[PDB]
Amino acid sequence: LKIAAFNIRTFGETKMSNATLASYIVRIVRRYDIVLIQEVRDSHLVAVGKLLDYLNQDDPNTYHYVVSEPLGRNSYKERYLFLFRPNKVSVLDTYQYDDGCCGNDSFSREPAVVKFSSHSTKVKEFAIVALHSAPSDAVAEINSLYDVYLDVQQKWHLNDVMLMGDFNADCSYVTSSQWSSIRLRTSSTFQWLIPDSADTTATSTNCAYDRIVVAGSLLQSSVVPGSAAPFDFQAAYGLSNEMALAISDHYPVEVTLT
Amino acid sequence: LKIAAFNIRTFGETKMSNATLASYIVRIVRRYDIVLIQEVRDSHLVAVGKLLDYLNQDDPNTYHYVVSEPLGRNSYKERYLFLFRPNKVSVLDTYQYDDGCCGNDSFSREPAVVKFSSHSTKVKEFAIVALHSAPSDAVAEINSLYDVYLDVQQKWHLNDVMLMGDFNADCSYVTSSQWSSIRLRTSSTFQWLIPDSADTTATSTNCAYDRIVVAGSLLQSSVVPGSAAPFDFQAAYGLSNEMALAISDHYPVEVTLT
Ligand SMILES: *[C@@H]1O[C@H](CO)[C@@H](O[C@@H]2O[C@H](CO)[C@@H](O[C@@H]3O[C@H](CO[C@H]4O[C@H](CO[C@@H]5O[C@H](CO)[C@@H](O)[C@H](O)[C@@H]5O)[C@@H](O)[C@@H](O)[C@@H]4O)[C@@H](O)[C@H](O[C@@H]4O[C@H](CO[C@H]5O[C@H](CO)[C@H](O)[C@H](O)[C@H]5O)[C@@H](O)[C@H](O)[C@@H]4O)[C@@H]3O)[C@H](O)[C@H]2NC(C)=O)[C@H](O)[C@H]1NC(C)=O
Ligand SMILES: *[C@@H]1O[C@H](CO)[C@@H](O[C@@H]2O[C@H](CO)[C@@H](O[C@@H]3O[C@H](CO[C@H]4O[C@H](CO[C@@H]5O[C@H](CO)[C@@H](O)[C@H](O)[C@@H]5O)[C@@H](O)[C@@H](O)[C@@H]4O)[C@@H](O)[C@H](O[C@@H]4O[C@H](CO[C@H]5O[C@H](CO)[C@H](O)[C@H](O)[C@H]5O)[C@@H](O)[C@H](O)[C@@H]4O)[C@@H]3O)[C@H](O)[C@H]2NC(C)=O)[C@H](O)[C@H]1NC(C)=O
Ligand SMILES: [Ca+2]
Ligand SMILES: [Ca+2]
Ligand SMILES: [Ca+2]
Ligand SMILES: [Ca+2]
């Protein structure tokens, strides 16, 4: 099973309306059984609907989806979009993490949580926790995912959970001496599949912003060793830097389950 | 490997000075490779020293030990005593959990923590967290052991931890609707080996006060199925109720590791 988390810079109407851009997006998505899309700036679901049009153009059930409400604390809002192949996986349950709220809420974009059924893999049931952190508050946010894990355990009684997304987990946003502050890192319950030395950005910076974390021995046993990696689409398609950048400034991060 | 946690009511000088009482205590202890002794009321270590006298009477290295400082918030104090066979196990490290302190500390008797090396078992390294809770504050205390687990993970980077002792985890002290409040119970990270239906008291009450909790798949795989149980010494030796009671009002709880 192939899973990815992809931050598509300003995913929306304007972007999906460009057939050249749309075409590459479809391409990327089709590589996966499950894909988490972030930075969905689409209040009326027009862009999401254009994407599904393309994905299901030949079969109405190529891809199914789960979308959250537009989330954010200030005025700027984004959705979490999960696309999945219904022939591979099934959605058992979903819930939005209740963070509070104002002044008290712990996240700009509280995590969407989805429980999947996967018959082809070792793990038969697992949950994915999505997080697109706020740069400014990266440390606090990643640290709070430890509380989300707990919430999942209390609700579904499941230990098998994959935490993923654009955590802004490197460079200016999470510096060297701040890892101490993050429970999701200091607790050995969790394995970080994308290492600190990985480059998940399409621009010239070298930062491991995008990450994949897993908890659960059944899930941890299901990851194919060395499969977790950012997907450099620029290299893959022989794109120009300006063309790679018009797609996104981030690479998708993927992992394979067996 | 055979491990037990035993609350010996008012373990001290008076008690150890009774050769008939002392004799049974030795008997019980010798059944185990590792034994956690609670309710050690021995400011000057006289009782602890009398017990070691007996245990090592034939070989100076029959049993080794780790003792905490006398702990408590009010005036009443107790030590945590760990006895172990040096030929079976080894102490790698130990520390006293730092709870605060006054007004702020989370435990009457903050947990003593010991990391063991066990060559005969599947798990080669694991930690034991001792807790003799305050009846009055049982719920809060058991709930705080979730924070201790974390502390252990941050310090030793170990997931394999056994949490044990007289938690006062039943009857008046932890009622039916209060289990919700305990993270050590609602988190599926932990397996409770002593069930709620077990009787760990030597008196006429039927309460599972004494418990054994494990976290870590390596440790969880090492427990021998169905070995976790209270040791009814009254039944075992054909003791009178007044004689069983002069030993303790609690049964030891034991488990076997393979
Ligand atoms: C969806 O997504 C993709 C990815 O985002 C999009 O593709 C990108 O698109 C653009 C164009 O929209 C292209 O950008 C460059 O832009 C210039 C624009 O023109 C400049 O110059 C103007 C006048 O200057 C002269 O031009 C010569 C070359 O630029 C110059 O050397 C000469 O001396 C003069 O200066 C002026 O208008 C400006 O303000 C501009 O900065 C493009 O010209 C450049 O490429 C060139 O292309 C033309 C072809 O265009 C002409 O012909 C047809 C038919 O009549 C058109 O109608 C146009 O109206 C015409 O201009 C050639 O004539 C040249 O020889 C020349 O080399 C260049 O394209 C990208 O680089 C491109 N990126 C990728 C990698 O695809 C796309 O926009 C999106 N979708 C849609 C269109 O909406
Ligand atoms: C360490 O631990 C263990 C466990 O804690 C200890 O064992 C327990 O110990 C005691 C005794 O210390 C024993 O308790 C019972 O107590 C009475 C005490 O006497 C009562 O009566 C007195 C006068 O009454 C008469 O007594 C008859 C029987 O009780 C009665 O039926 C008759 O009509 C009268 O009433 C009075 O002093 C009281 O205030 C008392 O309440 C014991 O007698 C009873 O058992 C009996 O034992 C005697 C033997 O004792 C005598 O002989 C030697 C030699 O001279 C002694 O010096 C004593 O001084 C004497 O009294 C018999 O004569 C009887 O026939 C009678 O049945 C009973 O023992 C426990 O039950 C015992 N428990 C166990 C299960 O072992 C031990 O104390 C500890 N270690 C040490 C000693 O310090
Ligand atoms: Ca929020
Ligand atoms: Ca880069
Ligand atoms: Ca204390
Ligand atoms: Ca009982």
XYZ file of C-alpha atoms and ligand atoms in Angstrom:
686
model
C 0.000 0.000 0.000
C 1.439 3.419 -0.920
C 0.639 6.427 1.224
C 1.633 10.080 0.835
C 1.160 13.491 2.427
C 1.366 16.414 -0.015
C 1.249 20.140 0.649
C 0.118 21.672 -2.645
C 0.814 25.377 -2.378
C -2.414 27.308 -2.663
C -4.408 24.314 -3.884
C -7.510 25.868 -5.333
C -9.629 27.026 -8.212
C -6.984 29.023 -9.969
C -4.538 26.112 -9.825
C -6.952 23.337 -10.811
C -8.141 25.495 -13.753
C -4.717 25.257 -15.344
C -4.856 21.972 -17.329
C -1.024 21.664 -17.469
C -0.810 22.070 -13.647
C -3.892 19.881 -13.111
C -2.313 17.193 -15.238
C 0.794 16.865 -13.089
C -1.270 16.933 -9.891
C -3.355 13.994 -11.131
C -0.154 12.150 -12.073
C 1.304 12.551 -8.597
C -1.917 11.523 -6.829
C -2.325 8.385 -8.971
C 0.970 6.984 -7.612
C -0.828 6.418 -4.284
C -3.506 4.349 -2.604
C -3.974 7.011 0.088
C -3.021 10.681 -0.255
C -3.393 13.488 2.261
C -3.656 16.852 0.551
C -2.906 20.030 2.479
C -3.259 23.744 1.894
C -6.695 23.270 0.300
C -7.904 26.876 -0.076
C -11.408 26.057 -1.325
C -14.327 27.455 0.635
C -16.896 26.140 -1.833
C -15.263 22.863 -2.838
C -14.930 23.853 -6.504
C -11.242 22.819 -6.695
C -11.825 19.556 -4.826
C -14.671 18.824 -7.254
C -12.450 19.590 -10.322
C -9.815 17.193 -9.011
C -12.326 14.368 -8.421
C -13.621 15.015 -11.937
C -10.221 14.156 -13.315
C -9.524 11.259 -10.993
C -12.858 9.486 -11.624
C -13.087 10.477 -15.296
C -13.048 6.813 -16.385
C -14.583 5.081 -13.364
C -16.811 6.891 -10.849
C -15.168 4.902 -8.058
C -11.467 5.388 -8.930
C -11.060 7.570 -5.822
C -13.288 8.343 -2.830
C -12.582 11.105 -0.302
C -12.993 12.660 3.161
C -12.656 16.463 3.471
C -12.615 18.486 6.690
C -14.322 21.889 7.171
C -12.126 24.930 6.317
C -9.898 25.291 9.483
C -7.935 28.238 10.933
C -7.916 30.702 13.843
C -7.424 34.031 12.083
C -9.159 34.617 8.735
C -7.016 32.425 6.494
C -8.473 28.857 6.226
C -7.532 25.453 4.761
C -9.076 22.010 4.513
C -7.502 18.604 4.983
C -8.312 16.386 1.973
C -7.846 12.603 2.052
C -8.141 10.769 -1.312
C -8.156 6.937 -1.297
C -8.769 4.004 -3.687
C -11.889 2.238 -2.433
C -10.708 -1.033 -3.911
C -7.688 -0.973 -1.624
C -8.876 0.701 1.548
C -12.033 1.576 3.383
C -12.956 4.344 5.826
C -14.160 2.988 9.139
C -14.579 6.243 10.994
C -13.416 9.841 11.051
C -13.423 12.695 13.501
C -12.021 16.184 13.822
C -9.770 16.654 16.886
C -11.451 18.916 19.428
C -8.678 21.365 20.517
C -10.893 23.964 22.474
C -12.270 27.447 21.347
C -11.160 31.938 21.985
C -7.490 32.035 23.226
C -7.349 28.320 24.384
C -7.205 26.071 21.245
C -3.878 24.269 20.687
C -3.777 24.226 16.858
C -4.359 26.594 13.944
C -5.616 23.607 11.913
C -6.764 20.915 14.384
C -6.039 17.469 13.006
C -8.520 15.528 10.972
C -8.392 11.821 11.974
C -9.315 8.891 9.767
C -9.438 5.210 10.579
C -8.811 2.898 7.625
C -9.401 -0.779 6.936
C -6.590 -2.319 4.813
C -6.985 -5.985 3.864
C -3.829 -6.229 1.755
C -1.453 -5.330 4.609
C -0.138 -6.755 7.877
C -1.930 -4.056 9.860
C -5.677 -4.444 9.109
C -6.746 -1.254 10.840
C -4.904 1.976 11.505
C -5.592 5.699 11.790
C -3.904 8.625 10.050
C -3.622 11.980 11.857
C -3.140 14.957 9.516
C -1.303 18.085 10.490
C -0.393 21.189 8.491
C 1.332 23.179 11.301
C 1.608 26.970 11.653
C 5.288 27.841 11.038
C 5.316 30.258 13.970
C 3.939 27.654 16.275
C 5.514 24.500 14.944
C 7.110 23.342 18.204
C 3.899 23.710 20.263
C 1.826 22.016 17.563
C 4.053 19.034 16.980
C 4.225 18.646 20.778
C 0.413 18.635 20.974
C 0.223 15.684 18.552
C 1.280 13.613 21.575
C -2.118 14.569 23.099
C -3.910 13.680 19.865
C -2.341 10.151 19.898
C -3.825 9.702 23.370
C -7.203 10.912 22.148
C -7.168 8.350 19.362
C -6.223 5.597 21.813
C -9.083 6.588 24.109
C -11.614 6.677 21.254
C -10.727 3.740 19.014
C -8.526 1.758 21.404
C -5.998 1.582 18.623
C -2.237 1.917 19.010
C -1.544 1.781 15.249
C -1.450 5.459 14.154
C 0.373 7.315 11.399
C 0.917 11.038 12.028
C 1.813 12.969 8.866
C 1.967 16.242 7.068
C 3.740 19.508 6.635
C 4.982 19.974 10.210
C 7.453 22.762 9.272
C 9.779 20.486 11.307
C 13.200 21.945 10.433
C 15.233 25.076 9.703
C 13.803 28.261 11.220
C 10.665 26.682 12.607
C 12.028 23.783 14.741
C 15.699 24.446 15.569
C 18.255 22.082 17.051
C 17.714 22.782 20.714
C 13.918 22.694 20.441
C 13.489 18.915 19.835
C 13.698 18.497 23.562
C 10.365 20.245 23.874
C 8.534 17.828 21.644
C 6.938 14.764 23.296
C 6.158 13.287 19.910
C 9.936 13.078 19.509
C 11.240 12.326 23.013
C 8.736 9.532 23.544
C 10.123 6.283 22.043
C 6.532 5.201 21.348
C 7.013 6.949 17.970
C 9.284 6.283 15.015
C 10.153 9.141 12.656
C 10.373 7.674 9.097
C 11.444 10.911 7.433
C 14.793 11.840 9.080
C 16.042 15.381 9.858
C 18.543 15.176 7.009
C 15.799 14.713 4.338
C 14.923 17.572 1.899
C 11.126 17.828 1.436
C 11.034 21.257 -0.250
C 10.960 21.905 -4.036
C 12.829 25.281 -3.560
C 16.589 25.759 -2.893
C 16.285 25.323 0.903
C 17.298 21.954 2.458
C 14.655 21.351 5.133
C 12.751 18.280 6.351
C 9.479 20.094 6.864
C 7.223 17.191 5.763
C 7.205 14.134 8.030
C 5.769 10.693 8.648
C 5.611 9.346 12.272
C 4.191 5.890 13.251
C 3.196 4.388 16.571
C 1.981 0.766 17.025
C 4.153 -2.400 16.665
C 1.740 -3.922 14.037
C 1.991 -0.743 11.899
C 5.725 -0.325 12.558
C 6.202 -3.971 11.369
C 4.174 -3.163 8.192
C 6.413 -0.314 6.888
C 8.737 -1.503 4.081
C 12.253 -0.549 5.194
C 13.651 2.436 3.396
C 10.480 3.214 1.484
C 9.763 6.383 3.445
C 11.021 9.286 1.374
C 10.093 12.590 -0.246
C 9.091 12.189 -3.950
C 11.216 14.668 -6.005
C 8.815 15.262 -8.918
C 11.192 17.771 -10.475
C 13.808 15.039 -10.977
C 11.213 12.460 -11.891
C 9.662 14.399 -14.799
C 12.678 16.481 -15.744
C 10.851 19.667 -14.859
C 12.242 23.198 -14.900
C 12.551 24.895 -11.485
C 9.772 27.420 -12.372
C 7.510 24.580 -13.502
C 8.277 22.433 -10.426
C 7.567 25.513 -8.301
C 4.230 26.249 -9.978
C 3.107 22.797 -8.753
C 4.375 23.261 -5.221
C 7.265 24.367 -3.109
C 7.076 21.060 -1.200
C 7.677 17.445 -2.284
C 5.085 14.829 -1.289
C 6.483 12.361 1.399
C 5.492 8.715 0.874
C 5.933 5.348 2.529
C 4.983 1.819 1.497
C 3.111 -0.626 3.729
C 3.235 -4.374 3.284
C 11.801 -15.042 35.916
C 9.342 -14.567 38.802
C 8.440 -11.077 39.939
C 6.180 -9.900 42.767
C 4.936 -6.754 44.485
C 4.082 -7.205 48.175
C 2.579 -4.748 50.633
C 3.645 -6.031 54.053
C 1.501 -4.209 56.576
C 3.686 -2.161 58.870
C 6.904 -3.834 57.735
C 9.358 -2.917 60.431
C 11.374 -3.683 63.508
C 8.564 -5.050 65.583
C 7.496 -7.397 62.785
C 10.955 -8.611 61.756
C 11.754 -9.282 65.449
C 9.098 -11.973 65.562
C 10.919 -15.111 64.303
C 7.635 -16.893 63.388
C 6.518 -13.854 61.306
C 10.040 -13.344 59.922
C 10.114 -16.965 58.864
C 7.029 -16.723 56.671
C 8.213 -13.431 55.169
C 11.493 -15.054 54.106
C 9.542 -17.982 52.639
C 7.382 -15.703 50.517
C 10.323 -13.605 49.288
C 12.358 -16.681 48.293
C 9.689 -17.664 45.730
C 10.859 -14.703 43.612
C 13.743 -13.418 41.535
C 12.570 -9.818 42.005
C 10.332 -8.582 44.825
C 9.051 -5.080 45.494
C 8.297 -4.561 49.165
C 5.981 -1.764 50.254
C 4.944 -0.172 53.518
C 8.530 -0.270 54.823
C 8.261 1.764 58.047
C 11.976 1.781 58.891
C 13.647 5.146 59.336
C 16.964 3.607 60.363
C 16.997 0.519 58.155
C 17.040 -1.903 61.097
C 14.182 -4.038 59.688
C 15.623 -4.049 56.166
C 18.949 -5.149 57.669
C 17.268 -7.977 59.696
C 15.593 -9.244 56.534
C 18.844 -9.245 54.519
C 20.451 -11.084 57.432
C 18.020 -13.919 56.945
C 18.077 -13.905 53.168
C 21.894 -13.972 52.869
C 22.441 -16.177 55.929
C 24.073 -18.896 53.794
C 25.531 -16.869 50.923
C 26.310 -13.143 51.203
C 25.066 -12.681 47.641
C 21.731 -14.562 47.808
C 19.881 -11.236 47.481
C 20.973 -7.677 46.677
C 18.743 -4.617 47.089
C 17.804 -1.017 46.228
C 15.934 1.030 48.872
C 14.453 4.504 48.428
C 14.540 7.286 51.070
C 11.538 7.319 53.475
C 8.766 9.037 51.359
C 5.549 10.872 52.324
C 3.975 14.345 52.411
C 2.568 14.508 55.935
C 4.561 12.940 58.787
C 3.956 9.262 58.063
C 6.727 7.810 55.798
C 7.525 4.581 53.913
C 10.321 3.243 51.747
C 10.164 1.237 48.545
C 12.370 -1.872 48.865
C 13.435 -3.929 45.837
C 15.097 -7.316 46.565
C 16.624 -9.257 43.636
C 18.812 -12.338 42.990
C 22.057 -11.048 41.495
C 22.589 -14.315 39.672
C 19.401 -13.735 37.708
C 19.170 -9.989 37.273
C 21.286 -6.893 37.443
C 20.529 -3.249 38.238
C 21.483 -0.938 35.407
C 20.199 2.307 36.834
C 17.722 3.730 39.311
C 16.108 7.060 39.983
C 13.406 8.533 42.168
C 10.590 10.221 40.193
C 10.694 13.981 40.692
C 7.021 14.966 41.336
C 7.586 18.664 42.559
C 7.667 20.129 46.185
C 4.767 22.472 48.997
C 1.191 22.016 47.574
C 2.304 20.944 44.000
C 3.692 17.343 44.186
C 1.535 14.679 42.489
C 2.227 11.696 44.790
C 2.393 10.913 48.504
C 5.108 8.335 47.725
C 6.709 9.299 44.381
C 7.699 6.199 42.454
C 11.098 4.637 42.720
C 12.250 3.457 39.250
C 14.678 0.641 38.556
C 16.083 -0.573 35.273
C 17.027 -4.256 35.200
C 19.150 -6.428 32.936
C 17.664 -9.947 32.504
C 19.658 -12.388 30.370
C 17.348 -15.371 30.850
C 14.292 -13.674 29.306
C 13.024 -12.430 25.947
C 13.166 -8.828 27.145
C 16.828 -8.117 28.060
C 16.177 -4.742 29.643
C 13.115 -3.314 31.330
C 12.201 -0.920 34.133
C 9.877 -1.421 37.098
C 7.935 1.561 38.490
C 6.793 1.105 42.104
C 3.713 2.719 43.525
C 2.068 2.421 46.940
C -0.828 4.899 46.386
C -2.646 6.996 49.007
C -6.166 5.515 49.314
C -7.734 8.976 49.350
C -5.930 9.949 46.221
C -5.827 6.698 44.319
C -7.450 7.961 41.112
C -5.129 10.992 40.768
C -2.062 8.887 41.550
C -2.760 6.036 39.188
C -3.520 8.667 36.523
C -0.139 10.321 37.156
C 1.684 7.040 36.431
C 0.953 7.869 32.782
C 3.315 10.865 33.253
C 5.919 8.653 34.921
C 5.904 6.254 31.895
C 6.717 9.261 29.715
C 9.511 10.283 32.065
C 11.050 6.834 31.815
C 10.803 6.924 28.019
C 12.516 10.314 27.935
C 15.320 9.183 30.264
C 16.135 5.622 29.223
C 14.469 5.561 25.802
C 12.828 2.349 26.872
C 9.247 1.327 26.138
C 9.432 -1.886 28.208
C 8.110 -0.880 31.669
C 6.293 -2.754 34.414
C 4.206 -0.588 36.759
C 3.270 -2.367 39.997
C 2.195 -2.128 43.569
C -0.600 -1.490 45.972
C -2.611 0.984 43.882
C -5.743 0.714 46.092
C -7.334 0.184 42.640
C -10.802 -1.092 43.606
C -13.718 -0.854 46.037
C -14.000 2.498 47.820
C -10.840 3.991 46.391
C -11.341 3.598 42.594
C -15.059 3.116 41.857
C -16.710 2.026 38.631
C -17.235 5.392 37.022
C -13.743 6.642 37.881
C -11.741 4.419 35.456
C -12.508 6.965 32.804
C -10.276 9.416 34.612
C -7.231 7.205 34.505
C -4.919 7.531 31.470
C -2.958 4.501 32.582
C -6.181 2.593 31.914
C -7.752 4.365 28.925
C -4.508 4.334 26.968
C -4.165 0.979 25.134
C -0.379 1.317 25.453
C -0.827 -0.557 28.768
C -2.008 -4.050 29.622
C -3.447 -4.734 33.080
C -2.352 -8.286 34.105
C -4.261 -8.325 37.383
C -7.960 -7.919 36.410
C -10.636 -6.010 38.384
C -12.228 -9.279 39.479
C -9.051 -10.467 41.316
C -8.910 -10.520 45.172
C -5.515 -9.240 46.411
C -6.453 -8.737 50.082
C -5.887 -11.265 52.919
C -8.994 -9.916 54.828
C -12.686 -10.651 54.031
C -13.000 -7.858 51.426
C -12.885 -8.794 47.697
C -10.812 -6.016 46.121
C -8.134 -5.902 43.409
C -6.022 -3.288 45.132
C -2.630 -4.719 44.045
C -1.857 -4.544 40.322
C 0.669 -5.263 37.604
C 0.619 -3.124 34.381
C 3.064 -3.581 31.425
C 3.888 -1.422 28.437
C 6.319 -2.446 25.637
C 5.698 -5.198 23.009
C 8.989 -7.026 23.946
C 7.932 -7.132 27.635
C 4.288 -7.894 26.803
C 5.542 -10.853 24.657
C 7.675 -12.061 27.631
C 4.801 -12.486 30.160
C 3.749 -16.155 30.513
C -0.002 -16.211 29.854
C -2.078 -16.611 32.958
C 0.839 -16.416 35.361
C -0.165 -13.016 36.716
C -2.028 -13.611 39.953
C -2.180 -12.791 43.655
C -0.383 -15.425 45.827
C -2.858 -16.567 48.556
C -0.359 -17.536 51.280
C -3.171 -18.382 53.677
C -4.334 -21.196 51.378
C -0.805 -22.186 50.491
C 0.399 -22.799 54.068
C -2.940 -23.650 55.635
C -2.740 -20.623 57.886
C -5.377 -19.400 60.327
C -7.008 -16.050 59.462
C -5.339 -14.336 62.489
C -1.962 -15.754 61.469
C -2.414 -14.808 57.787
C -3.422 -11.332 58.971
C -0.388 -10.914 61.231
C 1.741 -11.299 58.069
C -0.285 -8.869 55.997
C -3.735 -7.837 54.965
C -2.638 -7.995 51.307
C -1.529 -10.908 49.095
C 1.631 -10.460 47.005
C 0.818 -10.224 43.191
C 3.254 -12.095 40.929
C 3.860 -12.728 37.255
C 6.316 -14.943 35.387
C 8.515 -13.749 32.524
C 9.976 -16.053 29.913
C -0.452 27.244 -16.654
O 0.792 26.976 -16.153
C 2.053 27.110 -16.815
C 2.994 27.012 -15.607
O 2.589 28.092 -14.703
C 2.130 28.293 -17.730
O 3.289 28.347 -18.611
C 4.192 29.513 -18.449
O 3.722 30.603 -19.238
C 4.393 31.676 -19.803
C 3.532 32.538 -20.706
O 2.207 32.807 -20.275
C 5.833 31.537 -20.183
O 6.500 32.702 -19.718
C 7.377 33.492 -20.475
O 6.744 34.685 -20.765
C 6.995 35.466 -21.931
C 5.907 36.567 -22.013
O 6.317 37.604 -22.870
C 7.338 38.505 -22.404
O 7.783 39.425 -23.424
C 6.791 40.273 -23.972
C 7.295 41.063 -25.155
O 8.765 40.781 -25.194
C 9.294 40.131 -26.325
O 9.321 38.744 -26.116
C 10.365 37.865 -26.347
C 10.286 36.692 -25.380
O 9.718 36.767 -24.046
C 11.653 38.681 -26.195
O 12.757 37.862 -26.028
C 11.544 39.773 -27.276
O 12.731 40.542 -27.521
C 10.598 40.801 -26.588
O 11.007 41.239 -25.480
C 5.893 40.981 -22.985
O 4.512 40.701 -23.281
C 6.196 40.653 -21.547
O 5.686 41.513 -20.549
C 6.825 39.323 -21.238
O 7.668 39.212 -20.103
C 6.924 34.492 -23.116
O 6.991 35.061 -24.408
C 8.180 33.585 -22.907
O 8.251 32.739 -24.023
C 8.124 33.208 -25.379
O 6.922 32.717 -26.006
C 6.450 33.221 -27.199
C 5.148 32.546 -27.565
O 4.050 33.478 -27.254
C 3.350 34.213 -28.395
O 2.538 33.498 -29.327
C 1.214 33.105 -29.097
C 0.448 33.266 -30.465
O 0.280 34.554 -30.989
C 0.622 33.949 -28.150
O -0.680 34.466 -28.311
C 1.294 34.872 -27.191
O 0.343 35.869 -26.844
C 2.573 35.331 -27.699
O 3.429 36.116 -26.872
C 7.499 33.223 -28.299
O 7.075 34.153 -29.321
C 8.872 33.622 -27.826
O 9.849 33.430 -28.852
C 9.211 33.442 -26.404
O 10.418 32.736 -26.169
C 7.853 32.713 -21.701
O 6.831 31.757 -22.076
C 6.456 30.282 -19.425
O 7.826 30.357 -19.425
C 5.549 29.131 -19.166
N 6.165 28.121 -18.273
C 6.069 26.823 -18.527
C 7.451 26.221 -18.045
O 5.079 26.372 -19.288
C 0.781 28.696 -18.363
O 0.773 30.184 -18.451
C -0.494 28.374 -17.639
N -1.709 28.343 -18.395
C -2.332 29.183 -19.154
C -1.667 29.839 -20.335
O -3.015 30.153 -18.752
C 4.750 -13.646 67.031
O 3.641 -13.892 66.269
C 2.590 -14.828 66.527
C 1.544 -14.329 65.520
O 1.299 -12.927 65.871
C 2.236 -14.952 67.976
O 1.351 -16.056 68.327
C 0.048 -15.694 68.937
O 0.195 -15.553 70.347
C -0.718 -15.701 71.379
C -0.107 -15.608 72.764
O 0.888 -14.617 72.970
C -1.877 -16.632 71.220
O -3.030 -15.945 71.689
C -3.977 -16.467 72.582
O -3.824 -15.827 73.796
C -4.124 -16.417 75.059
C -3.569 -15.486 76.167
O -4.176 -15.772 77.403
C -5.541 -15.361 77.600
O -6.100 -15.845 78.840
C -5.437 -15.437 80.022
C -5.965 -16.135 81.251
O -7.163 -16.891 80.767
C -7.154 -18.296 80.860
O -6.671 -18.856 79.668
C -7.212 -19.894 78.931
C -6.870 -19.725 77.457
O -6.658 -18.444 76.808
C -8.720 -19.871 79.203
O -9.419 -20.599 78.255
C -8.839 -20.095 80.722
O -10.158 -20.359 81.223
C -8.535 -18.670 81.272
O -9.297 -17.763 80.844
C -5.110 -13.967 80.134
O -3.702 -13.789 80.379
C -5.539 -13.157 78.940
O -5.622 -11.754 79.085
C -5.638 -13.850 77.610
O -6.576 -13.375 76.659
C -3.439 -17.792 75.058
O -3.465 -18.512 76.274
C -4.248 -18.593 73.988
O -3.753 -19.904 74.014
C -3.554 -20.649 75.230
O -2.157 -20.902 75.482
C -1.694 -21.368 76.694
C -0.188 -21.477 76.665
O 0.366 -20.328 77.404
C 0.930 -20.546 78.805
O 2.127 -21.302 78.995
C 3.424 -20.803 78.819
C 4.320 -21.461 79.936
O 4.065 -21.136 81.274
C 3.431 -19.415 78.999
O 4.425 -18.757 79.753
C 2.271 -18.477 78.979
O 2.660 -17.327 79.717
C 1.045 -19.137 79.386
O -0.199 -18.443 79.306
C -2.416 -22.622 77.162
O -2.200 -22.759 78.585
C -3.899 -22.600 76.902
O -4.494 -23.868 77.190
C -4.416 -21.742 75.822
O -5.265 -22.401 74.898
C -3.850 -17.988 72.646
O -2.481 -18.358 72.351
C -2.090 -16.941 69.672
O -3.349 -17.446 69.455
C -0.874 -16.974 68.815
N -1.205 -17.052 67.373
C -0.554 -17.871 66.557
C -1.651 -18.358 65.526
O 0.664 -18.290 66.879
C 3.412 -14.696 68.942
O 2.847 -13.999 70.134
C 4.537 -13.802 68.507
N 5.790 -13.914 69.191
C 6.167 -13.818 70.422
C 5.547 -14.647 71.517
O 6.315 -12.745 71.052
Ca -7.783 25.355 15.859
Ca 15.057 21.510 -1.340
Ca 5.570 13.096 47.066
Ca -9.941 -11.032 50.141
